[PDB]
Design a protein around this ligand. Structure first.
Ligand SMILES: *[C@@H]1O[C@H](CO)[C@@H](O[C@@H]2O[C@H](CO)[C@@H](O)[C@H](O)[C@H]2NC(C)=O)[C@H](O)[C@H]1NC(C)=O
Ligand SMILES: *[C@@H]1O[C@H](CO)[C@@H](O[C@@H]2O[C@H](CO)[C@@H](O)[C@H](O)[C@H]2NC(C)=O)[C@H](O)[C@H]1NC(C)=O
Ligand SMILES: *[C@@H]1O[C@H](CO)[C@@H](O[C@@H]2O[C@H](CO)[C@@H](O)[C@H](O)[C@H]2NC(C)=O)[C@H](O)[C@H]1NC(C)=O
Ligand SMILES: *[C@@H]1O[C@H](CO)[C@@H](O[C@@H]2O[C@H](CO)[C@@H](O)[C@H](O)[C@H]2NC(C)=O)[C@H](O)[C@H]1NC(C)=O
Lengths: 109, 49
């Protein structure tokens, strides 16, 4: 878990090899690439309540909002099970109005 | 570990709190106190040196 102790980047595996008077290490490393731009937001206001992500980050391609993990990009529809609420949003800075989908209300119909 | 990627400072600070076990909910409601404490501490250390 320590950064750059063995290999440059995130570390996956290593293989040892012998030498006449030494050792040789083959490190396997994971490197992200081909990034993009996105517009973020700290938290979502909805019906007077503030929602934060559980493990991820809110992004918006320009019209709609999604929650994605930090190191990879796969947008998912915002729900009430992958986010958590804590208090009303009147002191948080950067809030944006939007709606939060839930499965239970459409399910009960 | 690669090319630099921009990020607002507040979200990076939230990640840093989330790393140590304190949830990110705490930081976002106490930004001013943290900023004031940080500034006072850095001024104090400058004066001490
Ligand atoms: C941002 O992403 C949303 C979600 O995919 C896009 O909205 C959809 O766009 C497609 C066209 O590619 C439509 O068929 C869908 O009906 C749209 N809505 C949904 C809910 O999927 C939106 O177009 C994207 N914004 C930009 C600028 O590309
Ligand atoms: C990010 O920085 C910009 C630059 O100042 C902020 O834009 C200002 O927003 C306020 C209110 O939203 C306006 O009164 C100012 O006129 C804006 N500044 C400019 C230069 O247009 C923006 O609010 C900042 N974002 C956050 C979340 O704080
Ligand atoms: C998000 O929604 C809130 C609540 O509807 C908006 O707050 C209202 O804003 C208008 C215009 O500024 C005021 O006249 C009202 O008094 C505000 N409160 C209410 C209860 O309506 C807010 O403007 C919306 N947008 C943002 C960016 O927060
Ligand atoms: C947590 O500690 C901070 C700082 O130790 C407190 O903030 C100070 O509160 C006193 C009490 O009135 C003020 O005189 C100072 O100006 C405050 N400092 C700053 C930087 O704002 C805070 O009140 C404490 N909170 C709790 C719940 O104990």
């Amino acid at each position: 878990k320590r950064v750059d102790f063995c290999g440059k980047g995130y570390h996956l595996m290593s293989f040892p090899q012998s030498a006449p008077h030494g050792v040789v290490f083959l490190h396997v490393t994971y490197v992200p690439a081909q990034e993009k731009n996105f517009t973020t937001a700290p938290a979502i206001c909805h019906d007077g309540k503030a929602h934060f992500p559980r493990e991820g980050v809110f992004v918006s391609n320009g019209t709609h909002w999604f929650v994605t993990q930090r190191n990879f990009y796969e947008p998912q529809i915002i729900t009430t099970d992958n986010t958590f609420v804590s208090g009303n949003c009147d002191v948080v800075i950067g809030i944006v109005n939007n709606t939060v989908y839930d499965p239970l209300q459409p399910e009960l119909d | 570990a690669g090319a630099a990627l921009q990020i607002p400072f507040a979200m990076q600070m939230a990640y840093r709190f989330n790393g140590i076990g304190v949830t990110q909910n705490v930081l976002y409601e106490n930004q001013k106190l943290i900023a004031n404490q940080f500034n006072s501490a850095i001024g104090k250390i400058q004066d001490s040196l």
